[PDB]
């Protein structure tokens, strides 16, 4: 064997071993979950609070690419922020040339080819981060995730982390009770309520809640981080749904 | 470019590819330095497992660096090539700049900080060469003899021999050597160089090389029987 | 284990071991403290001597006039990256005409140490940093792991022993927050925080190292006869 | 990362050696034998074809003996394609020197240059060395006729009567036996063949799995002639010396 | 990242085998047979279209290749070995000769120059040897016909007749029987088909079984008439139906 | 090395007691060609910066894409982006004043002439200048080409030192900015009558005048 | 053809006590025939008691001054926060100024 | 094998550890740092008698104001000093001044982990540099190949360091005069050096304000060993 | 044993790594088909989607690569998307340099070379697909041309690749052997879908509904996939017959 002591190398299933290894530090991580909405999308991630010492509202996790565009993610926190760096060097590529700001599908592309590079040679290491991400553009809201081999699909809503089995669930059930569309501001409550309900698989630290959204209507097409009275609105339904 | 690091350090604190270029030049035939009070003389063994040679034109042992330096060494000969070589050009950069030619001590620094860069660089192996580097300083009259040696270090001998059997031959130049009263003449300097060498030789026939080395760029080497009778005279004396 | 020979390898249970060493070289370094109110950020450093015969290794740091940063670890790694954090408070002063946020401080280094940890030849930087600074937004107190984690605490404390400290910083979180318009106040109480970290030694003249900034006082340091007064 | 796989081919051995360049001659020595011979007026090179096959164009080969300029061949004993790509620049060295300063290269300049060349592989670059060993048999107006050796070290020395590849051993011991400094060049041919015919690990010595050249003065006055030889020429040379 | 594979992958071992190289031949040996014959007016390159898939169309496939009007190729071993082979050896008779001499290349110096293509993946850094043998056949003004074989190492042997791979051991064998130096082309093309025959198992017709020759100029073949010293190709690759002609008188 | 094409005219400004006023015409001149009018030449950066730019206007679309991009770069990984921590007048200015200076040192320039009119955050008014050749200078009153030798004048009669700003109402400012494009439509030949102003206030904020006309010519006594 | 420099026109001067000196300078910036600035300072205090002027081209002038300033800054962080003497500051100009030898800053300078 | 660059499980760096054995098996080197002047001194040891030992240069000025010793693998040290003599120089062309002792030492050390897969292993010598200058004074530093440099009043380094380290331990003052740290040298060379110490196998040298960097005399060394003797001898 | 990690020969002159990346094709557990009618070429392929969070739209191993070239991916969707981007590139690229649309098997030829660059070279791993490309060529009419990651690549009459690969190849040369022809003799593309579909159920032995599936047509100047939609008017006309 030996298989797995090399990027890139294939086992004799036809498997790269150390993407594998790389999904096993995903696990690891704190929940982050992606709801689609009627005309855009809504993000929101589990901050354990490891000591009283945290400055609360101040170590944020999630990331805004362009104007339009939001990023979360799971695992390796650093190896999320280059991801999104290589993001931003993308956007700001496409729109210097084509104008237009870059469309999902275009972006989530960048992302998926950029991840999938670093499954090529041994001289690099796969990403440590399966990344949830999406926005509003010209043919309406995309959301997406992506994992450390490269593999990316369009999703109705998304979980990684820890808590990935119970957020699941959590959708499916939302995608069953609401096929006509479930709207902005309820995908924000039902955010919180998904992250305090996935929170059971990390309830030895007390975590802190971290909320965001794209709307048509709500933010103008724009990412925009949830404060003050509608994420106080949105913990407070939250805490009455656990008990 | 090719990038690995080949001569590192070992748990104990021993650069092992430097430690094995070191037998490399154990390997080697035995080359002998001894400075008199005028002049330095050269040795240096040619095994005889090779009859057939053509002595014309097979690449002498003492190599002329400069007109009044000479080079020799123990070990890989085709390593000593590009050393050599290095040293010769950079004999004539120094004639360009300085107006000057080398200083024995000068061409002895550079040539050891050759091997020196080639112990710490990407790529390469050391050099498996030990040198004696001899000479005379321009308007100089006090001889010079150096060493060198794959690790980068250099420095001074009134005698010193490098290659196999060298520690047989370096026993005999501690206790026959007097550095209150080195050899006065030529003829005792070469005398006592190849009295060190039939310590090892074999025969004195044509095994051994001699070059002498006096003040301003006088350099010539010894034929076959010019060497053979110090051979000859020596033997005779033996038998007491 | 077979997985620990690069950076550029994960575990089987997705870890990175030469990261981890990484980490292991910081929890060997001596003991520095970090704390702030809501005018002043305040660095105290335990120096470490070779013996009797030598001085007391440097711990503090300046970066530019309003941040700076304390290590635990490697020092000349420290030198590398503080060195880079000058550069990057300079670029901001003359293109922008601009203080560089502390904030953005950690963002760039957190940045500069993940390249190191995905690529094969390279090895992770083997030092912990305090950053301390007073910005457009207030005082401001950063903690920097070599695997690129960066985090902004009200306190803390890097290096060996250094759980006695954060456990003491934790119990007193909310009256050192409140000493607002007092420095000497402030020092006290991260000199008495780094005491819990002491043993068989004392704070002495030449041990103790001492650093803030604020809203009227420009980064600066304090050694020797200077820090008699807090003993 | 890719440290994994390197061989390291440029390192030595606890004992002093360069692995590379010892298993390199390793595989030399199951080469053809190629022989060399030195004669006051002019210079035999004699070389013995790898297990041939009938089916094999013998007149439009070429395997062992090679021409680097007008003045200078070369006899091969090793990997044939690494042969040719040392031969090639050794051919591009000689024209440059001709270009630079109007005169013919020296033989043993010529042959340094090549040896520096193998030398390089073995001290750096990571790459593997030259599975090659050259006879090299030439004249210039300084030395005369020369016959040099080189083999993947770097290393050169220059000879009366040498042999390389296969047999060296005992074919040396035959050289060493029969040769004299007064020799001719035709019986030099004949010392040659002779030696060869010794020490083949064929059944018997034949025309069609030789190659055969002189370097002789036997031109129209002072000046040299390179003769490659023919298919039918080995076969009369053959039955002249009567090996066959 | 970047090409950290610097060093060579192929490297001589303790009795002096270069194992990349024989492991080569190795996957030579696993390959198709192919062969080529010599005659006193032209030469014959033949060898099996092995398919894939009879849903496979193996027109598309080529295992016999134009390189120059007057020089083809034939291989056996690995596939794609041999198409980026051709497609670098056309290359290389166009920018190292063509475009220097205003001519093509005689088929020796073109063979050198694939030889040499082939002895770079022996040597140079992170890469592995070909794993295929050549037979070039060709024709030029001042050596007239000729046929060479190329192996992994780089080496390569003028032959009168030949064949590689598979059934190798056994061709070369008939062959020998077979071949005498008064040979006319036709006479080469009989032989080539009768020896092909006992290496090939299924199906023996000319869809099937890929042969080309080197023979005489093909005006016809030119496209354009005018220019007198321009007569044609001389490679000509024989169609299916040319083929089943001479299987009738076999 | 370059030569402006297209090409915009004079722009003019001026501080006053709580903040600073800023001008341009609506013009693109292509040589003695008036061939572009619907065109914008103040760039408003944020909720307090405007920037007027004159030359070349394909260079000016330029630093329109720098301005865009540097309000989208200075928003990532910025909670305070649109409080303590959004872009100031100053910060906007020193950007393109090592812009300019750069690329006149590459012997390759922007060729413009700027001027950034806003409001720190502290409530000081910014007015300063930069042009093609990276030489940048501030005053109460602020313009260039033509403007810099016919509006200067007229506004500096107004603010004609530092004491005379808190003495000066914006009514009194802008009365005196929309008197100076007047005074330039009549005596520059690449003047248009159509303009854009904007005033930076740090109590009402940034006013942004689109579509203004040049009124009460006098002509009869020709 | 495009000219890389300017005249700002403005004048400079200093004068040398015993314990102490002066560094003068008019506050007018002039481009041809017209005044740019009434009020703009050429004169500037770089720290560790150095006050410097760049009179000529302003582009290269504050660019100089910039530099010298940060030279200054660098100092300290270098040799531990040591005073840049008046002397060593000089020679330190003296290199700043040469490095652009074959594209001249276009400025005489006074500290 | 393994990565040049790679830590251990105890969170070092392999080669920078092993190096440091080399050090180890290195001559032995002494400083001493008084408010007169510093001293510095070092074991030749030469491998066998027929060598000139006046040719074993162990002890080296890279300025008038800034001297310097070495242990180890002393060949890897000159491109250390080739890099200290340009730094110090060029310094003063850019600044018109000698260059501060803890400024050079800095720079020294930014050589040292400048390798990997730059140079392809550390240096396998430590240095001693002393000097002087207006602000800081008389200063002694021991500059590794890890990158580090402490300050010492007094330091050892080489095969006899850590018996000499305790010895110095209990000799030094803050009053020690330049006379009293020669003869101190002298007697702690002589304690841990294999062979009998005389002027021809070790040698001395000093930096002082006034005369700068000088190497001593052999002649001069050997009246100051026949102090040391005496000295001994008369309690 | 490092040859069975890298593209290196092993003792039997095998390259275990490019044998690995065959293995790697079938990981997606999906079977594709592909025929070519008179007129048209078409290729047709299962679509599993697990998940019930997944947007169904989203999920995808057929591309359009030009507007006459169209490709289907037998393997990992990073890896099919690497090949499809370069695809995508190159024939841009043909078209700007050499003045005319890239053709199918050039293309082909082009990515397989590619191809078996990753099995010579050490650094470059091969990719883990089979690219299945198609088109109506305007010299060689309907085609067919399939590469590997060994670096092979070959004209078809008809194709088929996955798992259930060898059921699907039989099925369809039992039916060539009957018609006697080299294609569908049929007219409209959609009975070609028609018989696409048929032939794979009979080979499967499984029924598909609308979302079961995914079809890339290629016709004269374009090469198109169809909606769920479409597809579904095609299961109706196959299950009324
Ligand atoms: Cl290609």
Not at chain 3, 47 to 72: F, P, T, V, W
Not at chain 6, 44 to 50: F, K, R
Not at chain 8, 83 to 105: C, F, G, K, P, Q
């Amino acid at each position: 064997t030996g298989y797995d002591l090399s990027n890139s190398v294939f086992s004799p299933d036809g498997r790269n071993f150390q993407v594998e290894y790389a999904v096993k530090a995903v696990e690891n991580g704190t929940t982050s979950i992606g709801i689609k909405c009627n005309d855009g999308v809504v993000f929101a991630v589990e901050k354990l609070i490891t000591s009283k010492l945290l400055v609360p509202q101040k170590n944020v996790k999630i990331q805004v690419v362009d104007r339009h565009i939001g990023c979360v993610y799971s695992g390796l926190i650093p190896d999320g922020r280059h991801l999104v760096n290589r993001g931003r060097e993308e956007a700001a590529s496409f729109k210097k040339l084509y104008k237009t700001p870059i469309p999902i599908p275009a972006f989530a592309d960048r992302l998926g080819q950029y991840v999938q590079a670093h499954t090529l040679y041994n001289s690099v290491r796969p990403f440590g981060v399966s990344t949830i991400f999406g926005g509003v553009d010209k043919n309406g809201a995309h959301l997406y995730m992506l994992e450390p081999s490269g593999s990316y699909w369009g999703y109705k809503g998304a979980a990684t982390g820890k808590g990935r089995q119970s957020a699941k669930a959590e959708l499916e059930k939302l995608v069953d009770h609401h096929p006509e569309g479930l709207s902005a501001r309820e995908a924000v409550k039902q955010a919180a309520k998904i992250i305090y309900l996935a929170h059971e698989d990390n309830k030895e630290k007390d975590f802190e809640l971290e909320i965001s959204w794209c709307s048509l209507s709500e933010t103008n097409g724009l990412h925009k981080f949830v404060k003050g009275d509608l994420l106080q609105e949105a913990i407070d339904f939250a805490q009455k749904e656990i008990n | 470019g090719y990038d690995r690091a080949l001569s590192i350090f070992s748990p104990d604190g021993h650069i092992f590819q430097v430690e094995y270029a070191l037998e490399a030049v154990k390997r080697g035939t035995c080359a002998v330095g001894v400075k008199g009070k005028n002049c330095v003389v050269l040795g240096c063994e040619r095994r005889s497992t090779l009859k057939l040679q053509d002595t014309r034109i097979t690449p002498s042992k003492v190599s002329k660096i400069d007109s009044h330096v000479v080079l020799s060494f123990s070990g890989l000969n085709a390593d000593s090539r590009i050393l050599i070589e290095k040293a010769r050009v950079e004999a004539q950069s120094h004639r360009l700049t300085l107006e000057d030619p080398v200083t024995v001590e000068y061409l002895t620094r550079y040539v050891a900080g050759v091997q020196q860069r080639y112990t710490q660089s990407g790529g390469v192996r050391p050099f498996g060469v030990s040198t004696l580097i001899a000479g005379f300083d321009p308007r100089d009259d006090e001889p010079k003899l150096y060493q060198t040696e794959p690790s980068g270090i250099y420095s001074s001998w009134s005698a010193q021999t490098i290659g196999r059997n060298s520690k047989t031959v370096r026993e005999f130049l501690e206790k026959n050597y007097d550095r209150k009263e080195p050899p006065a003449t030529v003829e005792e300097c070469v005398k006592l160089t190849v009295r060190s060498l039939l310590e090892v030789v074999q025969t004195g026939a044509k095994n051994i090389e001699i070059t002498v080395v006096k003040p301003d760029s006088d350099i010539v080497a010894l034929s076959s029987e010019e060497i053979n009778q110090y051979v000859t005279q020596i033997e005779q004396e033996k038998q007491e | 284990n077979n997985y620990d020979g690069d950076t550029v390898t994960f575990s089987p249970t997705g870890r990175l071991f030469q990261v981890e060493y990484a980490l292991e070289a910081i929890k060997q370094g001596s003991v520095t403290v970090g704390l702030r109110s809501n005018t002043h950020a305040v660095l105290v450093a335990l120096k470490r001597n070779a013996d009797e015969l030598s001085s007391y290794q440097k711990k503090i740091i300046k970066c530019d006039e309003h941040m700076g940063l304390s290590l635990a670890g490697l020092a000349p790694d420290a030198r590398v990256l503080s060195n880079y954090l000058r550069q990057q408070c300079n670029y901001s002063s003359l293109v922008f005409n601009r203080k560089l946020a502390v904030e953005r401080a950690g963002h760039l280094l957190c940045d500069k140490a993940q390249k190191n940890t995905q690529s094969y030849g390279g090895r992770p930087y083997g030092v912990g940093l305090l950053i301390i600074g007073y910005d457009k937004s207030g005082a401001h107190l950063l903690e920097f792991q070599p695997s690129g984690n960066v985090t902004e605490l009200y306190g803390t404390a890097i290096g060996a022993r250094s759980q006695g400290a954060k456990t003491y910083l934790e119990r007193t979180l909310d009256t050192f927050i409140k000493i607002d318009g007092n420095p000497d106040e402030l020092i006290k109480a991260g000199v008495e925080a780094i005491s819990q970290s002491l043993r068989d030694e004392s704070l002495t003249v030449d041990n103790l190292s001492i650093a803030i900034v604020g809203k009227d006082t420009p980064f600066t340091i304090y050694d020797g006869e200077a820090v008699a007064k807090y003993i | 990362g890719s440290r994994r796989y390197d061989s390291r081919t440029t390192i030595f051995s606890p004992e002093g050696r360069l692995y590379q360049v010892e298993y390199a001659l390793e595989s030399i020595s199951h080469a053809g034998t190629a022989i060399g011979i030195m004669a006051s007026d002019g210079i035999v090179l004699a070389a013995e074809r790898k297990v041939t096959s009938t089916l094999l164009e013998q007149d439009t080969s070429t395997e062992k003996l090679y021409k680097l300029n007008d003045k200078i061949a070369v006899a091969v004993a090793g990997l044939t394609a690494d042969a040719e790509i040392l031969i090639n620049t050794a051919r591009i060295h000689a024209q440059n020197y001709l270009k630079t300063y109007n005169e013919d290269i020296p033989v043993e300049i010529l042959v340094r240059r090549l040896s520096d060349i193998k030398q390089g592989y073995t001290q750096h670059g990571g790459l593997r060395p030259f599975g090659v060993s050259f006879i090299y048999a030439g004249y210039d107006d300084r030395y005369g006729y020369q016959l040099y050796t080189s083999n993947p070290s770097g290393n050169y020395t220059g000879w009366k009567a040498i042999s390389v590849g296969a047999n060296t051993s005992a074919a040396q011991t035959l050289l060493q036996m029969d040769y004299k400094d007064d020799m001719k060049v035709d019986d030099a041919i004949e010392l040659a063949l002779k030696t060869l015919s010794k020490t083949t690990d064929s059944s018997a010595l034949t025309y069609d799995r030789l190659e055969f050249a002189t370097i002789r003065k036997g031109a129209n006055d002072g000046e040299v002639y390179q003769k490659i030889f023919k298919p039918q020429e080995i076969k009369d040379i053959l039955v002249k010396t009567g090996i066959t | 990242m970047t090409d950290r594979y610097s060093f060579s992958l192929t490297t001589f071992s303790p009795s002096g085998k270069l194992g990349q190289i024989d492991y080569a031949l190795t996957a030579v040996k696993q390959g198709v047979t192919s062969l080529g014959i010599k005659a006193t007016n032209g030469v014959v390159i033949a060898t099996e279209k092995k398919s894939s898939s009879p849903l496979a169309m193996s027109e598309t496939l080529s295992k016999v290749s134009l390189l120059t009007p007057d020089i083809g190729a034939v291989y056996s071993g690995m596939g794609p070995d041999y198409r980026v082979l051709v497609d670098k050896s056309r290359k290389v008779a166009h920018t190292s000769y063509k475009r220097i001499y205003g001519e093509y290349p005689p088929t020796k110096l073109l063979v050198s120059e694939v030889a040499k293509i082939m002895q770079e993946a022996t040597q140079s850094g992170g890469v592995r040897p070909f794993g295929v043998s050549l037979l070039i056949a060709g024709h030029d003004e001042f050596n007239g016909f000729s046929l060479y074989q190329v192996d992994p190492s780089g080496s390569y042997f003028p032959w009168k007749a030949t064949a590689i791979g598979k059934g190798s051991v056994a061709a070369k064998t008939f062959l020998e029987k077979r071949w005498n130096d008064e040979l006319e082309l036709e006479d080469a093309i009989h032989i080539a088909l009768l020896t092909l025959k006992e290496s090939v198992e299924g199906e023996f017709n000319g869809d099937t079984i890929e042969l080309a020759i080197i023979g005489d100029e093909n005006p016809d073949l030119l496209g354009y008439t005018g220019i007198p010293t321009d007569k044609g190709p001389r490679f000509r690759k024989l169609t299916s139906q040319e083929i089943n002609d001479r299987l009738e008188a076999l | 090395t370059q030569q402006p094409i297209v090409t915009g005219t004079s722009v003019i400004s001026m501080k006053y007691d709580n903040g600073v006023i800023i001008a341009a015409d609506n013009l693109g001149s292509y040589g003695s060609l008036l061939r572009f009018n619907g065109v914008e030449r103040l760039i408003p950066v944020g909720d307090n910066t405007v920037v007027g730019i004159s030359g070349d206007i394909s260079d000016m679309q330029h630093i329109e894409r720098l301005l865009k991009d540097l309000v989208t770069e200075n928003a990532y990984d910025n909670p305070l982006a649109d409080a303590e921590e959004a872009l100031e007048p100053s910060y906007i200015f020193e950007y393109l004043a090592t812009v300019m200076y750069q690329r006149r040192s590459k012997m390759n320039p922007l060729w413009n002439a700027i001027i950034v009119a806003g409001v720190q955050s502290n409530g000081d008014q910014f007015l300063r200048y930069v042009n093609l050749l990276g030489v940048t200078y501030s005053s109460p009153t602020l313009a260039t080409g033509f403007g810099a030798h016919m509006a200067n004048p007229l506004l500096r009669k107004v603010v004609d030192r530092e004491s005379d700003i808190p003495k000066t109402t914006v009514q009194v400012a802008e009365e005196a900015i929309v008197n100076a494009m007047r005074v330039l439509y009549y005596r520059d030949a690449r003047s248009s009558r159509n303009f854009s102003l904007a005033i930076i206030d740090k109590n009402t904020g940034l006013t942004f005048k689109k579509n203004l006309q040049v009124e009460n010519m006098k002509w009869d006594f020709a | 053809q495009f000219n890389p420099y300017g005249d700002n026109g403005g004048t400079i001067l200093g004068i040398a006590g015993e314990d102490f000196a002066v560094l003068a300078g008019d506050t007018r910036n002039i481009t041809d025939y017209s005044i740019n600035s009434r009020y703009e300072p050429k004169v500037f205090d770089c720290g560790d008691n150095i006050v410097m002027s760049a009179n000529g081209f302003a582009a290269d002038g504050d660019a100089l001054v910039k530099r010298f300033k940060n030279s200054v800054k660098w100092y300290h962080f270098d040799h531990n926060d040591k005073k840049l003497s008046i002397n060593s500051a000089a020679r330190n100009i003296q290199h700043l100024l040469y490095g652009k030898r074959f594209f001249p800053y276009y400025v005489h300078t006074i500290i | 094998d393994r990565g040049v660059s790679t830590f251990s499980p105890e969170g070092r760096l392999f080669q920078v550890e092993y190096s440091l054995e080399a050090i180890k098996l290195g001559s032995t080197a002494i400083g001493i740092a008084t408010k007169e002047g510093v001293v510095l001194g070092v074991e030749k040891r030469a491998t066998s008698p027929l060598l000139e030992s006046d040719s074993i240069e162990k002890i080296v000025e890279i300025d008038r104001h800034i001297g310097c010793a070495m242990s180890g693998l002393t060949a890897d040290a000159r491109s250390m000093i080739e890099h200290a003599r340009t730094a110090a120089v060029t310094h003063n062309l850019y600044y018109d001044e000698d260059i501060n002792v803890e400024s050079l030492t800095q720079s020294v050390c930014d050589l040292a982990l400048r390798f990997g897969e730059l140079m392809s292993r550390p240096f396998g010598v430590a240095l001693l540099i002393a000097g002087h200058d207006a602000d800081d004074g008389y200063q002694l530093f021991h500059a590794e190949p890890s990158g580090t440099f402490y300050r010492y009043n007094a330091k050892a380094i080489g095969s006899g360091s850590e018996g000499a380290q305790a010895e110095l331990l209990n000799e030094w003052h803050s009053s020690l005069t330049l006379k009293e740290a020669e003869l101190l040298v002298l007697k702690i060379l002589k304690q841990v050096m294999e062979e009998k110490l005389d002027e021809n196998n070790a040698q001395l040298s000093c930096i002082t304000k006034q005369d700068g960097f000088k190497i001593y005399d052999n002649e001069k060394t050997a009246e100051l060993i026949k102090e040391l003797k005496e000295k001994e001898a008369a309690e | 044993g490092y040859d069975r990690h890298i593209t290196i020969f092993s003792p039997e002159g095998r390259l275990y790594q490019v044998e690995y990346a065959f293995k790697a094709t079938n990981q997606t557990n999906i079977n594709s088909l592909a025929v070519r009618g008179k007129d048209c070429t078409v290729v047709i392929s299962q679509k599993k989607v697990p998940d019930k969070l997944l947007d169904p739209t989203t999920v995808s191993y057929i591309f359009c690569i030009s507007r006459t070239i169209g490709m289907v991916v037998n393997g990992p969707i990073p890896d099919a998307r690497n090949a499809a981007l370069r695809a995508k590139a190159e024939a841009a690229e043909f078209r700007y340099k050499y003045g005319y649309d890239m053709p199918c098997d050039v293309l082909a030829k082009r990515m397989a070379n590619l191809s078996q660059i990753y099995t010579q070279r050490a650094y470059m791993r091969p990719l883990g697909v089979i690219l299945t490309f198609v088109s109506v060529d305007e010299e060689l009419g309907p085609s067919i041309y399939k590469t590997d990651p060994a670096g092979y690549y070959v004209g078809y009459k008809a194709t088929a690749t996955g798992p259930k690969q060898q059921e699907i190849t039989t099925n369809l040369e039992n039916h060539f052997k009957k018609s006697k022809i080299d294609h569908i003799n049929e007219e409209s593309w959609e009975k070609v879908v028609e018989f696409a579909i048929t032939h794979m159920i009979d080979a499967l032995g499984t029924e598909f509904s609308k979302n079961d599936l995914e079809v890339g047509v290629a016709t004269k100047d374009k090469f198109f996939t169809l909606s769920a939609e479409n597809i579904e008017e095609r299961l109706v006309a196959i299950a009324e017959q």
